[PDB]
């Protein structure tokens, strides 16, 4: 995945 950080 990409930057899935909230």
């Amino acid at each position, epitope marked *: *995945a*990409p*930057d899935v*950080r909230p």
Partner: single-chain antibody, 227 residues
């Protein structure tokens, strides 16, 4: 207000070099990957590079078009991201934006550079709606069906080249984005729905799809809001 303040553009000769800067405020810069994206008349919106976190040893990835010539870096102690551009060519001409977070919520204001698996993502060229209507934009991949593994993003461009992210991760509304915007997957395309279009929503909408280790942007949809 998040701000991403860019500098460093100009007017350069084929074969020259230039370094762009972008300084972040209003969010925890060092927790998020950062990207450079450029806009040209010739090639629409094009993702250029990403850098991940200190915990990833600041790992980088580049579009094939710039690999070997461009270098992305960051300085977490100054909340800044940079793009060193070597061996510039006519085709590198355009407006350069630093952007990130969820995954393209926040865009810098842009800095102009004037130099003097071949995936296509397809959006409707234009759509026309009226205030109060429900309108759906779509985003198709040449590779087959769009899935949640393409982490579809939607971004809005308003006059003079002002970008804001609406949706990331298929259907997550970026912070403070109006409730009338939503993201979906509908018949193997990604979709943005405006439920009750407003006059101010007249704009160009872009989608971006992730393929393992890079982004591809669609050509954008010009939405006109009449009446």
């Amino acid at each position: 207000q998040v701000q991403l303040q860019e500098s460093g553009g100009g007017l350069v000769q084929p074969g020259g070099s230039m370094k762009l800067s972008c300084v972040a405020s209003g969010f925890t810069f060092s927790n998020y990957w950062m990207n450079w994206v450029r806009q040209s008349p010739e090639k629409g919106l094009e993702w250029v590079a990403e850098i991940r976190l200190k915990s990833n040893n600041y790992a980088t990835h580049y579009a094939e078009s710039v690999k070997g010539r461009f270098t992305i870096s960051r300085d977490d102690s100054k909340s800044s991201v940079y793009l060193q551009m070597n061996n510039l060519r006519a085709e590198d001409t355009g407006i350069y934006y630093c952007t990130g977070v969820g995954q393209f919520a926040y865009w810098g204001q842009g800095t102009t550079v004037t130099v003097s698996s071949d995936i296509v993502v397809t959006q409707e060229s234009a759509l026309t709606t009226s205030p109060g209507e429900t309108v759906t934009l779509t985003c198709r991949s040449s590779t087959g069906a769009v899935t949640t593994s393409n982490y579809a993003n939607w971004v809005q461009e308003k006059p003079d080249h002002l970008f804001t992210g609406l949706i990331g991760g298929t259907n997550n509304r970026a912070p403070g984005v109006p409730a009338r915007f939503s993201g979906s997957l509908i018949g193997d395309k990604a979709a943005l729905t405006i439920t009750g279009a407003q006059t101010e929503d007249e704009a160009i909408y872009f989608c971006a799809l992730w393929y393992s280790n890079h982004w591809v942007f669609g050509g954008g949809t010009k939405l006109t809001v009449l009446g």
